[PDB]
Design a binder for this molecule. Sequence first.
Ligand SMILES: CCCCCCCCCCCCCCCCCC(=O)OC[C@H](COP(=O)([O-])OCC[N+](C)(C)C)OC(=O)CCCCCCCCCCCCCCCCC
Ligand SMILES: CCCCCCCCCCCCCCCCCC(=O)OC[C@H](COP(=O)(O)OCCN)OC(=O)CCCCCCCCCCCCCCCCC
Lengths: 55, 157, 118, 459, 88, 65, 13, 77, 57, 170, 126, 106, 178
Amino acid sequence: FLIALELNNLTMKLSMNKANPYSSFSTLLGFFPSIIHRITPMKSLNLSLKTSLTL
Amino acid sequence: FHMTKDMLPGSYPRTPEERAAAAKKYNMRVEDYEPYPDDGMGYGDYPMLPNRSQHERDPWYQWDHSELRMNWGEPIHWDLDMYIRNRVDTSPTPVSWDVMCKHLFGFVAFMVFMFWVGHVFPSYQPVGPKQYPYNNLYLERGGDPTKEPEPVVHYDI
Amino acid sequence: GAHLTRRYLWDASVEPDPEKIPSFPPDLGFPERKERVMVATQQEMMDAQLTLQQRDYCAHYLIRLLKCKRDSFPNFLACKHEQHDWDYCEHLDYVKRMKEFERERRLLQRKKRRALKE
Amino acid sequence: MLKIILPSLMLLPLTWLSSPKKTWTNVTSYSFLISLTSLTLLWQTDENYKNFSNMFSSDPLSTPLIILTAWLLPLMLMASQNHLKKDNNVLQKLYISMLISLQILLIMTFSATELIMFYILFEATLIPTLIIITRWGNQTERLNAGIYFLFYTLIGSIPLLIALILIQNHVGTLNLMILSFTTHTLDASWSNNLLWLACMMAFLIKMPLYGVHLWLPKAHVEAPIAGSMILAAILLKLGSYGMIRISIILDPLTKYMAYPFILLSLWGMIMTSSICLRQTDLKSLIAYSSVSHMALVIASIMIQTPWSFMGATMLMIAHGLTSSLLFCLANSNYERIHSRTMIMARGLQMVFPLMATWWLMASLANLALPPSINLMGELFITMSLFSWSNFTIILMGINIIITGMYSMYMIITTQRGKLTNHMINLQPSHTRELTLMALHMIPLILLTTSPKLITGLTM
Amino acid sequence: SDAPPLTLDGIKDRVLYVLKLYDKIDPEKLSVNSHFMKDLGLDSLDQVEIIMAMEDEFGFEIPDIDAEKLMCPQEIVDYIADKKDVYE
Amino acid sequence: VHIQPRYREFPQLTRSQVIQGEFLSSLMWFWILWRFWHDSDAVLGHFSYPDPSQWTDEELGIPPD
Amino acid sequence: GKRLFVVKPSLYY
Amino acid sequence: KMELPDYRQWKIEGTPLETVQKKLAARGLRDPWARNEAWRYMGGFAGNITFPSVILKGFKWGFAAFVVALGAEYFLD
Amino acid sequence: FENKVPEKQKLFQEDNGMPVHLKGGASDALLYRATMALTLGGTAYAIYLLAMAAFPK
Amino acid sequence: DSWDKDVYPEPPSRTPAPSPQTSLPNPITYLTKAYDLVVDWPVTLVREFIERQHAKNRTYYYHRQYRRVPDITECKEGDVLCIYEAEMQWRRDFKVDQEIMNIIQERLKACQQREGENYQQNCAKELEQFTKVTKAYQDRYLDLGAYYSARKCLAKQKQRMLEERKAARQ
Amino acid sequence: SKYKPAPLATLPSTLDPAEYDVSPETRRAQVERLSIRARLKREYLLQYNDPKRVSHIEDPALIRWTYARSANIYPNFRPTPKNSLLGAVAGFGPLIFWYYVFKTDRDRKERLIQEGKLDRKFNISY
Amino acid sequence: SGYTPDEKLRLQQLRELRRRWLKDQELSPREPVLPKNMVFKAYRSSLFAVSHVLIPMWFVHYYVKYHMATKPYTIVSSKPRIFPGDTILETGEVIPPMRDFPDQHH
Amino acid sequence: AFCAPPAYLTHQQKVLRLYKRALRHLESWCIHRDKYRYFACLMRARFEEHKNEKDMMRATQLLREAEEEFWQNQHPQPYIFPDSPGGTSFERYECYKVPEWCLDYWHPSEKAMYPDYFSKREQWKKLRMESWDREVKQLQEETSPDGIMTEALPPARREGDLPPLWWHIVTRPRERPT
Ligand SMILES: CCCCCCCCCCCCCCCCCC(=O)OC[C@H](COP(=O)([O-])OCC[N+](C)(C)C)OC(=O)CCCCCCCCCCCCCCCCC
Ligand SMILES: CCCCCCCCCCCCCCCCCC(=O)OC[C@H](COP(=O)(O)OCCN)OC(=O)CCCCCCCCCCCCCCCCC
C-alpha cells in the first residue's frame, strides 16, 4: 500500500519519465495475447487452407 | 447473376494484354495488379493483395461491408477468411515483434529456471515428521487385520 | 529461517534434510525413553469420524471440540476454551517435532565431532 | 415389416391420384401416419430379434434407422415443397414419388435379412437420389457431382458383390443369422485379405472414408435439400449398418487389417475439421463436418468394441438428425438470399430471432453438448478408442477443439455481427420451415431424454 | 432517468462556453458563426485544440477528416447534433 | 430518486446515500476494533514460538563428551 | 414524455 | 431548461493551474485552456483528498460504537 | 566505458522544484523510501530491544 | 419398500441422543416440526388416498422364468436350432451377469458413502467382494469383442483351461 | 531503438519510408485509385438507394472470390516437383508416424497382456 | 481546409431532412393502439410462498419419500458423529468416556 | 465519418493528425490535468518553433523524425473514448439498429398498432420515389465524361429537389435506438 501510494505521488509529481520494458511488458499483458493469438491462429488457418482443403 | 467466363476468374496471365484484361476484370490498375507466381497452386490470375488484415482499414470510413471493412467491387484478398476482424490480426504493435517474442520467451525461461532452483533448494521449517499413532495408522488406512505390520514405535521428547 | 541459510550456504553435513528424521537410534543418549501415549482409541475415533490427517495425538481434544460444536450448534462463539485447548496441544506436538529436529541436528554435530576426534 | 412397407408403397398411387391442390397435404399427413406405424418396431421386450418373415426382420440396430427414415420423409416433403411451387404438377408428383421410393427402398434395405437383397436395395437407393441430384439441382456441376457420387458408389459396391457370391458359394445361404451362428475363422491368407477388402470398400466408399470422400461435398453442395437430407442422414448410416452386418464373418484378420483405415479416419476428421475452419461454403462445410463424424463412426466400427458399437449407433442417429437440421437452416438461408456463400449474410440474428435460436441449438447439438446423444456417442467412441490405444486421445482432442471452433464460427459469422442492411429480400419466417426446425430438434430432445432406444446390438 | 437528452440550445451554449473559456478568443467578439481565421484570428493548431476540447467536453471524439472540415461553432453544433441525433 | 443535472459544480448530495455510506464504513471499523479487542490473534498469535538454541542437551538426550 | 418509435423486425410470424 | 453557470466565475487563483502557469511564464509560454480546465479545482472539488481520510472514514463513529459496546459489556459483567 | 557525464549533467539542472536527493529519477526515490522505512524500522526494533533488556522476564 | 436387505445390505443406524448444552432454541427442530405439519401431513394424506384406490383396484404381475435348455457344449456345430437356443440362453445369462455387477457396484457405492472417511477400513469386505466378482467377470466375459457369442466365450474358456493345465504340469 | 515490423505486426503507414519520398507518378497512381474507388462506390450507392430494387445487391467481388477459392484450383493446378513433394509428405507422413506410434503402443500392450506384467485393475467394460 | 460549398450546401440539406425524419419517429399520444394490492408483506410475499414454494414442496416431498426411499440406495448418508458420553437412540447403550487427561495445563 | 477521405493526405493534414495523436497520447501518459496542460503547452511550443520552415524537404524530414519519436514514446494502452473504434462501448448497439425496411414486412396487425407513423412512412416513401427519379437525372448530368472523380456527392441545385442518394443518410437508424 505504501509503495504504491508513493509511486502514485510520483505520478502526481510534474515530470515525464522514459517508458521501460518492464512497464511495457506489464501493460501489454506479458505479450502473451498478441504473440500467441497471432501466431497460433495464423499457422493453424494457413495450414488448414494451404494444405488440407487446397492441396 | 449474368456472370460469364470473361469476367469470371480464369487462367494464369502470360501476355501484357491478358494481364490488362485481368486487371480490368478485377477492377484494378494494370501496374497495381500482380498475380501469384506460376508455381501451379491453383491461384490463377487472382491478384496478390497485400497481406494485411482488415484492422488496418480506416474504422471511421463508411464501408460498404461494415463488418468486413471493405467496399463494393474492390478485389477480395485470398485470405479474407483469415483476415476478418474476428480472426488473425496483423496490426502494428507499440513494440517490435522480435522484442515481444524475446521478452515472453525470456520470462517463461526465467520462471522455469527459478522454479527448478527452488525445487533443488526447497524451503521448510526446522521440524521433524508428523507423528502418527497405531503403526502410522495401519488399520485405518486399509491394512490387513490378519497380517501384523512392523511395529512403528514413537517416543516422547 | 536461518536453518535454510546454514544448510544451503555454510554446510550440509551438519544441517539435516527433513526426510531422514530420525537418522539416529532413539536409545542413543536416552537411557530410558518412554513410549508416547494418547487418550483416544481406534473405536471412539472411528465412531466420531476423524479424518486420517487429524488422527494425531491431540485426537481427544479434537473430540471434545467436536462434541462442543454438536451440542451447542447454536451460538457457535461458545467453543473457545476447548478450541484453545486443541490449539495448545497442537503447539505441544509441533514443539515436540522441533525438539526432535534440533536433537538430531545436535547429534549430527556430535557425530562430526567424533569423526574429527578420531 | 410388411405393415410399414405396403402403405408406403400405396403412397405412390396417393401421390399420382391426389388433386393438385391436395397432393402435398395428403402425402405429408399419410407419411406422418407411416412414421407412427413404423414406431411399433420399438416393442422389444427381449433379445429375440423381430424376424417378421423369412426375408424381413427388425433389430435394435435396424429399428432406429427405419424410424429415422420414416420420420424424415414428411420432413423431406416439407423442406422440398417450397422450391417446387414454380414447377409443373407432374414434376412435383414425380419428385414426391422419388422421395417415397427412396423411403420404401431404405426400409427394405434396413429390414433385409439377406446381404444380396441388401446389395440390390443398396443400388435401388443409389438410383433415385441420382435422379434427384441431377434433375432438381440448381447450378451447372450437379451433373458432374452426381457422376462422382454414382461411380464412387459403384466401384465400391462391385467387389462387395463379388465377395458376396463368393461367400454364398463357400457357406451356402448368405443369411445374416446363419452366418452369425456358423461363422468360420479365416486362415489369414492374401486371398482372405482381398475378400475382406472387397466386402469392406463399398461401405468405406459410402461412409465416406478419407481420400475417397471427394464425391460427398460437391454432391451436398449441388443436391436439393431433400438430397442433402437423404445422403447426410440415411445413406452414410446405411454404409455403416452394412459394415456392422458384414464385419461379423471377418474374424480374426480385421484386427490387423483395421490399422490403415483407423489412421485414415482419425487424420481425416482432423483435416476435414480444419477445412470446416477454412471453408467459404456453408453446405460444403456441413458436408465436411459429416465426413468427420462418419470418420469417427469408421474408427468405432473398425476397433470393434461394444462401447464403440454403442457410440457408433448414437453418432449415426444424432448426426443424421443434426445434419438434416443444419442443412435445413442452410437451405432456409439459401432460399432467402439466393446464394450459398457463408459470408454474404451475417446479421441474421437481428431479423430472425427464432431461426437464430434454432441455429444455436443445432450447432450446440453439432459440437456435442451434453447430455445429448451426440456427446454420448462421441464420448463412448472416445473411450473405446482410448481402450484400443491410449494415444488416440490427442487426435480426439484436436478433433473436438476444431469441431467446437467451426460450429461457433458458423454461429458467429451467420447470426451474430452487423446486419447486411442491403438485403431487402428477407422474408420474416415461414411457419413451414419453423415447423420443420421444431420437428428436427424435438426428437433430439426425446432421444436425449431416453438414450436406451438407440443403443444398438451390444448393450 | 439517467443521461438526459441533449438539445440544440444546450449544444450551442456548451460550445460557446468552451470558446468563451478559451483565451485567444475574446468572448465579446465571439459569435455562433464566427470563422476561426477570418474574423477570429486563429490557425490550424488552435482549431485542433478547440476540436479536442469539444471532444473532451461532449464525451465522444470527432474523426480527423470531419474535425478538419469543422471550422466554426455553427457546423460544430450541426455535427454534434447530427452525430447524437439531436433534432430539437 | 431523480436529481437535476448540474454543469460544472459539485452535485447535490442526498441524505440517504451519505448516511448509509458512513454507516457502512463505521460498521466496518467497529467490527475491526471489536475483534481486535477481543481476539487479537492476528499479531504474534498467542503462542510464543520458543528459541531452539537455549534448549539443553539433557532434555534433548544427546550423549555428553 | 418524448416516446420514440423503436424499429423491430416482424416478430408476429 | 438546464441553466448554465456564469463562465466569468472560472477564475484561476489558488490552483495547481497557476502552479503550471508560473512554471510556463518562467519558460515564457501561455496556456489558453486554464480557465476551461479550472472547474475541477474550484467549489466542491477544491480539497486535498488523502489516504487517511479515505480509509479512516467513519472511524470515529466506529470507535464511538466500539466504546459504547465495551461499556455495555462491562455493565453486563 | 564512454563519456556520458554531460548528458547526465542536464538531468540535474531541471528547475522543477524536485530536490537534489531525488533528482535521479524513480530509482533513488525507491532507495529513499526503503532506507527511510528501515532505519526507522530498525530504530523501533532497537528501542523495543533496549526496553526488553531493561525489563527482564 | 420393494427392496430387501438380503441383496441390499445396510447396517442399522446408530444416531446419538440430542444433548442441547446451550439455552438457545433449535431453528432446525422448529423448522422441521413446522415443515412436517404443513407439508408431510397433506402429502401422506393424499398418498393414503391413492394407496386405498390401489387397494380397490389391485392387480398382480409375475416374474417370468425360463427353463434350462442344454448348453452350447452339447450343441452340434452347423445345427443352427440348438445353437440359436443356447445363444439366446447365453445372452440372457450375460444380461443377468451385467445386472449382478451393477448390484455389486451399487453396494460398493453405498458402503463408501455410508462410511465416509472410514471407507478404507470398514469397506474391506465389500471391496474384496467387488474384486472377486470383477476377477470372475474378467475371466468369463472380457475381450470377447463387439460380436460376443457363446462360441467365443467357450473358446476363451477352453484356452484358459489349456493354459492353466499347462501351468499345472510344472 | 527502431521499430522492427513483421508479417503479423506490419509496419505503420505513417512510418514507412515509401511515403516521404513521394513522386508525381505515385501521386497520380493514388488519384486513379481514388477514381476507381469512387466509381465503384457510386455504382453501389445507386443500386443500394434504388427503391425499385426488390432483391439483394449481387457482388461480383464475392462471386469471383468464391469461384477462385472453390472451382478454379484444379483448372489452374499444374504438377511441379515442389507441390508433388509437399502433397506426398502431407498425405503420407502423418499417417506413417501415427501408424508407428500406434503399432509400438499396441505391441507393448499386447505383449504385456500376454506375459502378464500389466495388471488390469477393474477393466470389465472395455 | 474547411467545407467546400458543394458539401456545405449538401450537408445542410441532409441535416434538414434528418430532423424531419427524426421528428416523424415520435409517437402520437394514442400510440401504441393496444387491443387488492394490500402491502408487500401481507400480499406480495404471501401468495408467492404458498404457490411457487409450498405447492412444489408437496410435489417434491411426494417424490423423495414414495419414489426415493422405496428404492434401495437412493438416499444414502454418512453415519452421524458418535462421541464418548453419548446415548444411542436406536439401540440404547452409552458410549464409555475417555481416559483421565493427564495434562491439564491450559 | 460524414466526409470521404481524399486520394492523398496533404502535409498540413498529416502534421495536424500527428499533433492531435501526440496530444492524445500525452494526456494518456500524463493522466493528471495540470501535468497534461503543462506538457501540452510544451508540445505546442515545439510545433510552433518548427512551424516556420521554408525548405519543406527538412519539413518532411522533421515530420518523419517526429513520427518515429511518437511511435517510440507512445502509450501502450492509450485512452480511447467509449464510442471510438476500439473502445469499450463501440458497436454496442449495432444489435439494436434495425434497418427501416422491416417495417414494410410488418404484419397488418402491427401496421394497425401504429397508424400515424405508418402514414408518415408512406408519405416519405412517395417522396423517395419522386426524388429518386429526379436525382438519378441530376447525378447523370453532374458526372464528368472523363477525368478525376471523388466520392463526394452534389447537392440539390433547384427548388423542390432533394440531394442525390439521400436515403441511407436520412433514414439511417439512431445511434441510441433504445
Ligand atoms: C472402391 C475401391 C476400388 C479399388 C480397390 C478395390 C478392392 C481392392 C481389393 C480387392 C481386390 C479387387 C476386387 C476383387 C473382388 C473379389 C475379392 C475376392 O473374392 O477375393 C478372394 C479371391 C480369391 O479366391 P479364393 O479365396 O477362392 O482363392 C482360392 C484359394 N484356395 C485355393 C487356397 C482355396 O481373390 C480374387 O479373386 C482377387 C483377384 C482380383 C483380380 C482382378 C482385379 C481387378 C482390379 C480391381 C480394382 C479395379 C477398380 C479400381 C481401379 C483404380 C481406381 C483408381
Ligand atoms: C428410436 C429411434 C428414434 C430415431 C428418431 C425418431 C424421430 C421421430 C420420433 C417420434 C416419436 C418417438 C420418440 C421416442 C423417444 C420418446 C421419449 C420417451 O418418452 O422416452 C421414455 C421416457 C421414459 O423412459 P424410462 O424407461 O423412464 O427411461 C430410462 C430409465 N431406465 O420418457 C420420459 O422420460 C418422458 C419424456 C417426455 C417428457 C418431457 C421431457 C423433456 C426433456 C427436456 C430435456 C432438456 C435438455 C435438452 C438438452 C439438449 C441438448 C442438445
